[PDB]
Design a protein around this nucleic acid. Structure first.
Ligand SMILES: [Mg+2]
Ligand SMILES: [Mg+2]
Ligand SMILES: [Mg+2]
Ligand SMILES: [Mg+2]
Ligand SMILES: [Mg+2]
Ligand SMILES: [Mg+2]
Ligand SMILES: [Mg+2]
Ligand SMILES: [Mg+2]
Ligand SMILES: [Mg+2]
Ligand SMILES: [Mg+2]
Ligand SMILES: [Mg+2]
Ligand code: NA
Ligand code: NA
Ligand code: NA
Ligand code: NA
Lengths: 158, 207, 17
RNA sequence: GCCUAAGACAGCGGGGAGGUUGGCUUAGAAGCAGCCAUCCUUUAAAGAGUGCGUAACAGCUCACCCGUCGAGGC
């Protein structure tokens, strides 16, 4: 048979257990084999969570690896160069991004999002910041969101 | 006449009047992610709006009088089930194929039945011993342990078109990961140029 | 610190049984 | 008096989605141990979740929408 398994691993730091472990060893494949080559395709990606799909055949021995796109909270912390975000969101800053920065993230995740417009991908991303103690353009993001709608920025687009 | 309802009928009427072909589609049983996928893929080819069936019917009947068009009043006759308005420039037959293309297979569950034949294909099913064998008991799926792993005896027919799939004959098929029926936007009927096309007519192929 | 089929970070979990 | 045939209460069936396993914390902590936040998107609608549940996931449920029913509800 062929079974596909996705787990999110720390990029470069992938180990033989668990998260990857309970997810493959039932596929009758050797464990490190699908570990070396992960830390290969996620070298650049050091320290961050990233989705990894392992397409295994259980029959005749073989696997393959598809490195996916990191979650949004991840992409945010390495435009900030941080590892752990706020303990009390909206009670502390951590935590600042410029609107062009968020845009760059939005195009990366827009294709997995529901939003069919850039401006909506961005409003999404801003929402995630509201959960983390990050601010954009030096203000609460709930506000930047209002402004994109109010037609304040608008030049950063089209 | 809750104010939201008047504007609702207004919005529907706008759609109806706005394009040459008006279709009622059944939206029921389509899970949200598939529906989001589909709204996304046909977004620039069509407009699609779900509403209560009673309001879609006013909107059709009112639109009909404004346009002096008796046969899209007749379209209201087909508003049934999970009904939604879809309006476009595509001729109906192209619309039908566009929507058939975009359906998807899903588990059959308890009390509906067979669009086609189901069926179980054999070899290993992956599971360890357990209650699952004492689950292919009832169903007449012949089963035993082969190589320490659950396996069915046969490529059988448990069903055939026209008679009932048991409640738990279905949740067996679900755990087997079997997807016999297609789900998606299903056309109840389509109006264009003084004609109402029905699913019978829209189906016909080349012989 | 131990079990079979039971955690997320260290090393135990689940399986046959 | 207000809501209600442009569809009441109750039941039943379907949908109950995406960023996203929100941040933190934790061995784990994914709506549902705890702390903080509680936005945005597709929408007919759908809480950063009401209760079960699971080691965590899963699953069941509930809000919410649509259907069915058809005369009452506050
Ligand atoms: Mg998109
Ligand atoms: Mg009626
Ligand atoms: Mg009701
Ligand atoms: Mg229900
Ligand atoms: Mg349900
Ligand atoms: Mg976590
Ligand atoms: Mg939590
Ligand atoms: Mg869940
Ligand atoms: Mg829990
Ligand atoms: Mg909303
Ligand atoms: Mg009264
Ligand atoms: Na239906
Ligand atoms: Na999800
Ligand atoms: Na602990
Ligand atoms: Na949790």
């Amino acid at each position: 048979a062929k079974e596909v398994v996705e787990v999110l691993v720390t990029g470069g730091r992938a180990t033989a257990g668990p998260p990857l472990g309970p997810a493959i060893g039932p596929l009758g494949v050797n464990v490190m084999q699908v570990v070396k080559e992960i830390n290969e395709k996620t070298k650049d990606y050091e320290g961050m969570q990233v989705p990894v799909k392992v397409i295994v055949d259980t029959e005749t021995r073989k696997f393959e690896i598809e490195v996916g796109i990191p979650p949004t909270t991840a992409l945010i912390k390495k435009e900030l160069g941080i590892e752990t975000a706020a303990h009390e969101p909206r009670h502390e800053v951590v935590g600042n991004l410029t609107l062009e920065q968020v845009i760059k993230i939005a195009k990366m995740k827009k294709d997995a999002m529901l939003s069919y417009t850039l401006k909506n991908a961005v409003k999404e991303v801003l929402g995630t910041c509201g959960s983390m103690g990050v601010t954009v353009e030096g203000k609460d993001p709930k506000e930047v969101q209002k402004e994109i709608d109010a037609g304040v920025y608008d030049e950063y687009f089209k | 006449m809750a104010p939201w309802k008047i504007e609702e009928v207004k919005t529907l009427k706008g759609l109806i009047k706005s394009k040459p072909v008006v279709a009622i589609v059944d939206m029921m049983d389509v899970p949200a992610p598939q529906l989001q996928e589909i709204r996304d893929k046909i977004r620039d080819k069509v407009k699609l709006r779900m509403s209560r069936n009673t309001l879609i019917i006013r909107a059709l009947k009112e639109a009909a009088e404004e346009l002096n068009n008796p046969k899209l009043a007749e379209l209201a006759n087909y508003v049934e089930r999970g009904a939604a308005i879809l309006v476009t420039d595509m001729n109906p037959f192209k619309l039908y194929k566009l929507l058939e293309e975009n359906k998807s297979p899903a588990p059959v569950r308890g009390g509906q039945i067979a669009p086609c034949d189901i069926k179980v294909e054999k070899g290993s099913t992956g599971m360890p011993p357990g209650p699952f064998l004492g689950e292919l008991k009832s169903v007449g799926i012949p089963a035993a342990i082969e190589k320490g792993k659950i396996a069915i005896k046969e490529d059988k027919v448990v069903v055939k078109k026209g008679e009932v799939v048991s409640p738990k004959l279905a949740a067996v098929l679900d755990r087997l990961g079997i997807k016999p029926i297609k789900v998606g936007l299903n056309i109840l009927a389509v109006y264009e140029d003084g004609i109402i096309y029905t699913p019978d007519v829209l189906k016909v192929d080349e012989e | 610190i131990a079990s079979a089929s039971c955690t997320t970070x260290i090393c135990t979990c689940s399986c046959s049984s």
